[PDB]
């Protein structure tokens, strides 16, 4: 199947309290595997997946240097952006950076992306052609010109098509036993009477990986039962995910309702009744 190597960088300025807080995390598919947090005297990039301890000290030293330098660059960018918008020093502001490379089912480079946001809104985008930028306003147009002056699109294209692709291949091989292992959901249905005439049927999906999943309550010919309550897919805390879907049914008709669960770890979709 398809796979992705993704990083998320966040820098938040702390007025009157020193350098901005900087936190970055790396993901392979739906699995976090590294983290960097500058809230320390000697901040380090550290593993967040057990299979990354196969990486030696040189890897960790290099990633620590890269992340420390990114934080300093982001402190500069926050100051630059504060001047672009003529904003006071008394206000807290946020700069975010996300980038990633995605492989197709053939294992070849399919798409790369890179984007910046300021105070929770799109700021500057590296287009999927990997050769041009798009600015959201006049401030970001100056940032676009800087990127043009430095051939930044060419530099980021090289990272996304070469460095990113190569290391995604390495990570997938080192963590194959978990990254390439589809974990099917464990499913069951719970029943909670609301009154003498109504009841809640809750269809559970527990302990699955990856996070992509579909839950539907079927009521005879209606595949998506009216007023089905879906919760956002949520992490269990152990690397797997959870989700449930609930419906209120007339008491005594629970047998007319069927829950469908579709997940890539299931050879066929599963149906359940209370």
């Amino acid at each position: 199947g398809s796979h992705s190597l993704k990083y998320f960088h966040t820098s938040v300025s702390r007025p009157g309290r020193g350098e901005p807080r900087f936190i970055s995390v790396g993901y392979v598919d739906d699995t976090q595997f590294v983290r960097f947090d500058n809230d320390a005297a000697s901040p380090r990039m550290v593993p967040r997946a057990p299979w990354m301890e196969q990486e030696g000290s040189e890897y960790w030293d290099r990633e620590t240097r890269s992340a420390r330098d990114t934080a300093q660059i982001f402190r500069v960018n926050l100051r630059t952006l504060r001047g672009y918008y003529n904003q006071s020093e008394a206000g807290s502001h946020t700069l975010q950076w996300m980038h990633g490379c995605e492989l197709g089912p053939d294992g070849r480079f399919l798409r790369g992306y890179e984007q910046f946001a300021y105070d929770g809104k799109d700021y500057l985008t590296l287009n999927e052609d990997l050769r041009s930028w798009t600015a959201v306003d006049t401030a970001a147009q100056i940032s676009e010109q800087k990127s043009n002056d430095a051939s930044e699109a060419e530099h980021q294209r090289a990272y996304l098509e070469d460095t990113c692709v190569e290391w995604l291949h390495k990570y997938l091989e080192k963590g194959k036993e978990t990254l390439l292992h589809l974990e099917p959901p464990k499913t069951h249905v719970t029943h909670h009477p609301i009154s003498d005439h109504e009841a809640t049927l809750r269809c559970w999906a527990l302990g699955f990986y990856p996070a992509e999943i579909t839950l539907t309550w079927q009521q005879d010919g209606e595949g998506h039962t009216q007023d089905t309550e879906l919760v956002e897919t949520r992490p269990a805390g152990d690397g797997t995910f959870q989700k449930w879907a609930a419906v209120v049914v007339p008491s005594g008709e629970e047998q007319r309702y069927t829950c469908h669960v579709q997940h890539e770890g299931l050879p066929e979709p599963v149906t359940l009744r209370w």
Binding site: Y7, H9, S24, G26, Y59, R62, E63, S66, A67, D69, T70, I73, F74, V76, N77, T80, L81, L95, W97, H99, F116, Y123, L124, S143, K146, S147, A150, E152, H155, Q156, Y159, T163, W167
Partner: peptide, 9 residues
């Protein structure tokens, strides 16, 4: 791994 040099804005 992540980029060595992050873009300037």
């Amino acid at each position: 791994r992540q980029p060595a040099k992050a873009p300037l804005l």
